[PDB]
Amino acid sequence: PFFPPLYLGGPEITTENCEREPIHIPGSIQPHGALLTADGHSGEVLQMSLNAATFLGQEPTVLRGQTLAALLPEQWPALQAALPPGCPDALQYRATLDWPHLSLTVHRVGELLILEFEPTELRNAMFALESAPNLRALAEVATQTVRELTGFDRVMLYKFAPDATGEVIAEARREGLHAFLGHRFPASDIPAQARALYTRHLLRLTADTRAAAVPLDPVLNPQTNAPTPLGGAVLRATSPMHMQYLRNMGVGSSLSVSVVVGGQLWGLIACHHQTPYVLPPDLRTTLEYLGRLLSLQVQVKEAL
Numbered sequence: 001p002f003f004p005p006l007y008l009g010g011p012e013i014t015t016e017n018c019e020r021e022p023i024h025i026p027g028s029i030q031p032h033g034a035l036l037t038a039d040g041h042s043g044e045v046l047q048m049s050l051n052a053a054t055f056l057g058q059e060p061t062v063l064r065g066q067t068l069a070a071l072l073p074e075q076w077p078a079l080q081a082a083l084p085p086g087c088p089d090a091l092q093y094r095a096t097l098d099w100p101h102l103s104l105t106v107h108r109v110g111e112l113l114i115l116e117f118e119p120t121e122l123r124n125a126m127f128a129l130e131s132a133p134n135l136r137a138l139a140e141v142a143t144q145t146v147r148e149l150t151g152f153d154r155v156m157l158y159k160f161a162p163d164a165t166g167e168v169i170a171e172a173r174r175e176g177l178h179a180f181l182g183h184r185f186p187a188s189d190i191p192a193q194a195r196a197l198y199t200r201h202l203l204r205l206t207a208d209t210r211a212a213a214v215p216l217d218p219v220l221n222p223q224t225n226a227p228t229p230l231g232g233a234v235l236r237a238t239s240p241m242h243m244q245y246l247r248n249m250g251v252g253s254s255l256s257v258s259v260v261v262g263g264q265l266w267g268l269i270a271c272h273h274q275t276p277y278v279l280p281p282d283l284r285t286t287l288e289y290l291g292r293l294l295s296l297q298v299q300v301k302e303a304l
């Protein structure tokens with residue numbers, strides 16, 4: 001069972017109890033975007049990240065209490081129609097706004113809407129994946145294609161063994177970087193609660209491995225007096241234990257995509273950049289689609 005989070009009197013995480021970190025409810029986000037939560041009926045703004053002013057151009061005490069009908073009068077009616085009560089937490093409403101461009105992503109958890117604001121601004125990929133004659137070739141073409149699309153310094157295909165140890169089975173990397181190909185890593189480097197979360201939510205990232213997390217205020221959802229679930233928010237703050245691991249490897253930006261085969265976490269497409277780096281929201285949607293394509297192709301090939 002999970003420890004309480006830091007804001008409910010829980011301990012700082014050490015290597016003795018990695019697996020008990022409640023990574024899904026950090027109560028904070030990464031600073032390259034802004035997050036609001038709102039009531040799914042009234043559109044009343046219930047929580048905001050403390051940096052929301054410098055993104056949305058209003059005072060911090062002024063935003064709390066207002067409704068989305070006032071703030072987003074064009075989007076509010078379509079948002080309600082798109083995410084009605086009872087819909088699953090995987091469904092996403094997406095829009096592009098002009099601002100004094102911002103990408104808006106919304107999902108629903110229970111009676112709460114979660115709004116993510118970020119600045120914004122493939123045919124041949126599909127047939128490259130289908131053409132591969134064996135599993136190795138598919139792995140190599142997948143990492144090389146993802147690197148061409150994104151510009152990341154390193155793209156790995158990271159495969160889980162039955163005992164949850166991992167191995168880099170294919171790799172595309174920048175000239176001068178040393179190889180991780182064939183190296184194996186202990187199960188605890190990606191602990192059990194992360195592996196479970198990564199089976200339901202297929203993409204996550206750390207844009208800057210040195211940036212401090214920005215709190216949500218208030219930290220608890222006023223509907224429930226309980227933590228806000230952020231498992232489905234890409235702006236979710238990353239575990240400080242993983243951030244340190246990345247800094248010690250010399251990585252400034254990290255992103256991975258889940259490869260899910262037969263409902264099981266088969267591997268990750270895992271990406272590194274040496275400097276901080278924000279991938280555009282449109283291009284993340286493409287990566288997500290490639291992960292599903294790769295999952296189907298990996299399934300049929302493992303028969304042979």
Ligand SMILES: *C/C=C1/C(=C/c2[nH]c(/C=C3[NH+]=C(/C=C4\NC(=O)C(C=C)=C4C)C(C)=C\3CCC(=O)O)c(CCC(=O)O)c2C)NC(=O)[C@H]1C
Pocket residue numbers: 014015016017018019021023166168180185188189190191194204205206237238239241242245254255256268270271
């Ligand atoms: C005691 C805590 C430990 C710990 C926790 C932890 N790790 C993650 C997430 C990831 N770890 C990854 C491991 C690797 N990346 C690599 O490049 C290599 C080697 C080539 C390894 C072994 C990966 C890929 C992830 C996923 C995220 C990403 O793509 O960057 C988490 C979950 C983080 C989050 O989602 O908030 C946690 C809690 N890792 C340890 O090593 C010990 C100290």
